[PDB]
Write a protein that binds this ligand. Structure first.
Ligand SMILES: Nc1ncccc1CO
Lengths: 237, 300
């Protein structure tokens, strides 16, 4: 069924599963034309496909050329996402293929279902969770490889860096969603927190700074504070 | 004109013959129905006064033999049977007519309703959907399930409708995932019309058959089948011009004939609003759209 607060922990059992987020697949800047009309110009996007147990991120970069001469792009984007996810599954060895795929937006269910007709035993599931994965383009290294791409390209990351050497999947996913929730709600402040101390660095092969366990607690605290404040402002409470 | 005699009427029952129905009292001297128009299939159906559950009935074509009804007190229902001895049958009938114990199929001459509801329905095709080859007539009831329903338990008691499934490999060509799902013309025209049904007449035949079973018996899987076959057409961008025009006439008479108090369970909001207002053919069903709005504007 649908994934929610109640079956939350199923994400960290030993059945392979992937989240798919399509928010950043079709990206446009909206601008004015010489004649005063409004036009869009697309920029490169990405599909965010994540194994929440292992941290493996399959970042498929969606180059603006895939939209050339196409109509109804926001609708096409959902099918292109489904096509690319299906191609990823087919590329994986059978023992690496997921048993479930959880889409973060319900509009992806039918496109993914039709593209995965060849995999009847892979469950396609929606979710009631409001996951912050749209904020993936607030991570500098992910944003950078997407914008620099000159062709379709798959880039692999571990979004947890080396955290699993020290913590469990459950705690690592919680850290990740907190970082992304903060980046989504106030990117400027969120990023000030992560880099304020020039002595804490990001390894060339990582996405986030190399915090000790104690500095992660101070970080996580500071990220919570940001998220609450913004909420009182949002709603005046 | 042909006749379907009744041995007797031992239990109080409402009897329908096509879109007509009569109330018969327990052991009232009733002996059948006369003046039945030759040249169309017909259905004779029953609802007992004591168990308003289980509407049941028989599809038949009088050109295929002599048929009568006899109550079975062991199985508890009015059964259709064939009389093979032609002289024995004319004799029974002539006697019952002479005693004026038969109702007359009450067709107004101006009325083409039954023709229009059964234009493509073929009795020989009905027997491939309801498989019981030792009989020339076909039994249907409220509770029977369809082959597709059974997939998602007794095969002998099944309605074999054409499985239609919009998220299936039969419906979706590899490499045309998006194309075929948003425009089902491939599945309509190549898979179903050319492949399975062979022509449009046949397709319309099954569609009318499914509607009639839904309306007369409240058969839920038939209703699902009728809506599915409408939706496949309405969701195709490319439909032969003669089919659209005929579809509009088919659906008009089906909506016209529906009891006004049954539109809640027999009519599927999603399909109708999509067919009439969102689909490719939103503009190609003028009569069906006009009668839907003036008679069931709530659903929409
Ligand atoms: N023509 C038909 N008449 C009744 C039932 C089914 C079909 C389809 O062959």
């Amino acid at each position: 069924g649908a994934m929610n607060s109640s079956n939350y922990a199923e994400l960290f059992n030993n059945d392979i599963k992937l989240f798919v987020d399509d928010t950043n697949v079709y990206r446009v800047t909206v601008h004015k034309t010489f004649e005063g009309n409004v036009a869009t110009k697309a920029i490169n996007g990405c599909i965010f496909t994540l194994n929440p147990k292992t941290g493996h991120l399959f970042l498929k970069i969606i180059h603006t050329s895939v939209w050339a001469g196409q109509k109804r792009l926001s609708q096409l984007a959902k099918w292109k996402t489904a096509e690319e996810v299906s191609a990823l599954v087919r590329s994986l060895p059978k023992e690496e293929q997921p048993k479930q795929i959880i889409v973060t937006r319900k509009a992806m269910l039918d496109p993914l279902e039709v593209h995965m007709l060849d995999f009847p035993n892979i469950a396609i599931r929606p979710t009631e969770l409001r996951l912050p994965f749209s904020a993936a383009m607030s991570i500098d290294k992910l944003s950078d490889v997407v914008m620099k791409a000159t062709e379709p390209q798959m880039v692999l990351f571990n979004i947890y860096d080396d955290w699993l050497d020290r913590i469990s999947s459950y705690t690592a996913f919680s850290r990740l969603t907190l970082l992304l929730r903060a980046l989504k709600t106030n990117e400027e402040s969120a990023k000030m927190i992560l880099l304020s101390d020039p002595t804490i660095t990001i390894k060339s092969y990582h996405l986030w700074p190399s915090f000790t366990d104690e500095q992660w607690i101070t970080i996580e605290s500071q990220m919570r504070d940001l998220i609450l404040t913004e909420y009182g402002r949002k709603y005046n409470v | 004109m042909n006749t379907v005699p009744f041995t007797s009427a031992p239990i109080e029952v409402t009897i329908g013959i096509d879109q007509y129905s009569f109330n018969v009292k327990e052991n009232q001297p009733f002996h059948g129905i006369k003046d039945i128009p030759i040249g169309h299939v017909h259905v004779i159906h029953f609802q007992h006064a004591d168990n308003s559950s289980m509407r049941y009935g028989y599809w038949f074509d009088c050109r295929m033999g002599n048929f009568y009804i006899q109550y079975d007190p062991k199985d508890g229902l009015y059964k259709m049977m064939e009389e093979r001895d032609g002289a024995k049958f004319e004799n029974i009938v002539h006697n019952f007519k002479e005693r004026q114990m038969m109702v007359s199929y009450p067709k107004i001459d101006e009325d083409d309703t039954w023709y229009n509801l059964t234009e493509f329905v073929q009795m020989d095709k009905i027997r491939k959907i309801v498989r019981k080859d030792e009989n020339q007539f076909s039994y249907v009831d409220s509770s029977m399930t369809t082959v597709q329903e059974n997939e998602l338990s007794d095969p002998a008691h099944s309605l074999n409708y054409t499985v239609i499934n919009f998220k299936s490999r039969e419906a979706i060509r590899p490499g045309h995932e998006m194309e075929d799902f948003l425009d089902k013309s491939y599945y309509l025209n190549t898979v179903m019309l050319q492949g399975i049904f062979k022509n449009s007449s046949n397709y319309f035949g099954e569609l009318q058959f499914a509607f009639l079973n839904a309306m007369f018996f409240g058969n839920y899987g038939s209703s699902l089948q009728w809506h599915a076959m409408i939706e496949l057409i309405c969701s195709s961008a490319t439909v032969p011009k003669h089919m659209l025009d005929k579809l509009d006439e088919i659906l008009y008479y089906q909506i016209k004939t529906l009891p006004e108090q049954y539109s809640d369970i027999l009519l599927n909001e999603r399909v109708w609003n999509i067919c009439l207002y969102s689909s490719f053919q939103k503009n190609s069903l003028h009569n069906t759209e006009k009668i839907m709005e003036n008679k069931y504007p709530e659903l929409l």
